Amino acid sequence: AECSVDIQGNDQMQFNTNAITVDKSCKQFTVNLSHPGNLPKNVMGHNWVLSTAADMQGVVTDGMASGLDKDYLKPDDSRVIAHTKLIGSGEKDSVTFDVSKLKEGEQYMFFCTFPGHSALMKGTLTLK
Amino acid sequence: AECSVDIQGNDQMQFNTNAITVDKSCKQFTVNLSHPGNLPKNVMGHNWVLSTAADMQGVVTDGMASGLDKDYLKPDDSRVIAHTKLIGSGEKDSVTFDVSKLKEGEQYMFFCTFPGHSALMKGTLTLK
Amino acid sequence: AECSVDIQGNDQMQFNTNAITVDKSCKQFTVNLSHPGNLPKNVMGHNWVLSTAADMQGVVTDGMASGLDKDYLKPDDSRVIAHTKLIGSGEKDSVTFDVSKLKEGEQYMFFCTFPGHSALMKGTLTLK
Amino acid sequence: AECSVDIQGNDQMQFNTNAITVDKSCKQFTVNLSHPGNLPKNVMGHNWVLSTAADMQGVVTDGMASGLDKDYLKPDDSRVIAHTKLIGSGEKDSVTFDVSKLKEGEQYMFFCTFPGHSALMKGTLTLK
Ligand SMILES: [Cu+2]
Ligand SMILES: [Cu+2]
Ligand SMILES: [Cu+2]
Ligand SMILES: [Cu+2]
């Protein structure tokens, strides 16, 4: 949609899109995440996390180490550009971030940091 | 598209959708598969294969065993409802099948049978 | 050894093997499962479950529905040939079963029924 | 064991381990890689490549771009601490490296650079 995308994380550990395009004319961009299905957060929680492609692994390893109560993200992690909370089925969360935080010609990855989901739940974000 | 869907399998071993719905009014249904990216067929080939969810695993296992030359599909496998060829980047292939081969209230799965790909490249198909 | 195998299911949602061959001369066969890592059972619990390839999807689907208190396995599911308990990190469990429950020529699959894990935590077992 | 590890990458695009610990008493560490299965190098080749977690993305991407003739690794990449050859099934390779090139407190990752494989063929290495 205009400077926003709606994305779903389902009970089969899948995001419904795997490529996000942000137009340079946008001052801000909003991601609206929902979780179709019936499984709870401790079993199939999902969040949408954005970092550069280079930082994804560091973000994922340290997130796993933060625990369920920390939504599997290291608090005040400097490499995370934007993120939602970790949501279970039937819940919703959105994030709006400034497009000035993205740079031309840098590769960005969005992903879910719940233990073991990033191998399957990830995609590219591109500023065009 | 009425009675068709276009789907893409990319260089990250991802399909761009995880759910196809077929309209019960469609007599036939076509799937148009393309492969964006730059990797060749032997490294990142993708096909779209349809079966019941209960048959998916035996089709994938026997497909692997048939190998390279057989497009990683057992020839005349009775469990395969429809399938494309295995394609590399920049190639395109379509498959049309009779919608009468599908039951309402039965669960179907589409997937790619290139070794290792079905872990990520799979989705549901249902009649509506 | 000869009629046993040690399997590990780790925090990355993977088993350390994807194929087990049971030697025809074994009267019984043992699977010893351990869980390297640090995550608790409610987030990354693993079990080793055996059925035929054709039954795997039914077992995983009824399993997921039965929930964590039932170790994500349908109570007294007749499609389950043998299974361990669902274990958390630092736990271990073993199951010994009679090899006469297996026949030559049938495809068997082993897998984890914790939601989402069978996508990666699956393998073939064959009586040879 | 202690200063060596045997690792295998199979036809299901998986390593048999996703965590290696190198003991600080080791002067040198040896990794022996084998490829179980039947698939050739150009379809499912594997290598074991070590770098810091922050450098892994860059190594994988430039590795992809170097091609099969370069074993999917950029020639003389200074980010690669150690690596094997790319091997097909039934092949094996060994690599020894100096443990003094590893510092305590730095996050390292080992992985495969054959296109697409690092998503699942990766793990941690830690000085302990
Ligand atoms: Cu998730
Ligand atoms: Cu594929
Ligand atoms: Cu599991
Ligand atoms: Cu590989």
UniProtKB/Swiss-Prot annotation, chains A, B, C, D:
* The entry's keywords: Copper, Disulfide bond, Electron transport, Metal-binding, Periplasm, Signal, Transport
Q: Where does Cu cation bind?
A: H46, C112, H117, M121
Superkingdom, according to UniProt?
Answer: Bacteria
Cited SUPFAM superfamilies: Cupredoxins
Instruction: Spell out the GO cellular component terms annotated for this protein, sorted alphabetically and separated by semicolons.
Output: periplasmic space; plasma membrane
- The intrachain disulfides are C3-C26
Instruction: Provide the Plastocyanin-like domain boundaries.
Output: 1-128
Give the matching Pfam families.
Answer: Copper-bind (PF00127)
> Has keyword Cytoplasm?
no
Localization per Swiss-Prot or TrEMBL: Periplasm
Q: Which GO terms describe its molecular function?
A: copper ion binding; electron transfer activity; identical protein binding; transition metal ion binding; zinc ion binding
Query: What is the stated purpose of this protein?
Result: Transfers electrons from cytochrome c551 to cytochrome oxidase.
The protein's name: Azurin
What organism is this sequence from? Pseudomonas aeruginosa (strain ATCC 15692 / DSM 22644 / CIP 104116 / JCM 14847 / LMG 12228 / 1C / PRS 101 / PAO1)
